[PDB]
C-alpha cells in the first residue's frame, strides 16, 4: 500500500532555469531540486557544475507554487541537489526529516510533472540501488517518502533513468544511491 500523499502534495513546486523545468520540494523557506536544472541540453553531456553555478544569479531561477511565483533570494549546491532560498516560508510544511534508506526497504513515490502531483505508488530499493519506478520526461525532483505517525521521512529525490528502464536518484542531502553520476553518459545497473 502507498502512504496517503496529502502532506507531500503541499510541498511540491515547479523550478525553471532557462528552458529546463523540473520539480522541487519546498520546506520552510528552502526549495530542494536536482542540480541538473542549471544545465542546457548540451551541458548535460559533460557538466562542469561548479562553473555553471557561478554563471547563474538568483533571478535566473523561476520557482512557482501553482500560479504564485516565489522570489529566489539565495542559492547553493549540496552534492547533487540545489538549494534555493526563497522569501516565503511554506505554510503547509509538515513535520519532516531526511533519512537515507537501505536496499530492501520500501517507500512511497509521489510522481509529479510541472510541479503538479500526478500519482502515488510504492517502490522498493533493489540491491544495486535502483528502483523500478514509473517516471517520464519532467519527473525529476519527484520525491520518495514514508510516514511515521505525523512525521514525513523524505528518502529519495528522482534524477535519472537507466538503459534497462530502472531509475536512480539521491537522498535529500544530494548523495546518490549507488555508483551513479548526474551526467548523460554511459551508465548501467
Ligand atoms: C528528469 N526530469 C529526467 C527523468 C528521466 C526521463 C526519462 N525517464 C526518467 O526518469 N532525467 C534526466 O533527463 C536525466 C538527466 C540528464 C539525462 N537523464 C537521463 O535520465 C538519461 N539517462 C542517462 O543518461 C543514463 F542512462 F545514463 F542514466 C535519459 C537518456 C534522458 C533517460 C541527466 C543530467 C542524467
Author numbering: 6 to 194
Study text:
In Severe Acute Respiratory Syndrome CoronaVirus 2 (SARS-CoV-2) and its closely related SARS-CoV, a single copy of the main protease (MPro, nsp5) encoded within the polyprotein (pp) 1a and 1ab mediates its self-cleavage (autoprocessing) at its termini (nsp4/nsp5 and nsp5/nsp6) and other cleavages between nsp6 and nsp16. The fully active mature MPro is a homodimer, with one active site per monomer, and exhibits a monomer-dimer dissociation constant (Kdimer) in the low micromolar range.
MPro1–196-GC373 and MPro1–196-NMV complexes crystallize in the isomorphic monoclinic unit cells with a P21 space group. Superimposition of the independent molecules in MPro1–196-GC373 (and in MPro1–196-NMV) with a monomer from the mature MProWT dimer39 clearly shows that the native dimer is not formed by the juxtaposition of the two independent molecules in these crystal structures. Thus, in agreement with our solution measurements, GC373 and NMV can covalently bind to the monomeric MPro1–196. Moreover, due to inhibitor presence, the C-termini in the MPro1–196-inhibitor complexes are better defined in the electron density maps, so we were able to model up to Gly195 (molecule B) in MPro1–196-GC373 and up to Thr196 (molecule B) in MPro1–196-NMV, the entire length of the construct at the C-terminus. Thus, covalent inhibitor binding reverts the oxyanion loop geometry to its active configuration. Similar to GC373, NMV interacts identically with the MPro1–196 active site as it does with the native protein in the MProWT-NMV complex. Direct hydrogen bond distances differ by only 0.1–0.2 Å in the two structures.
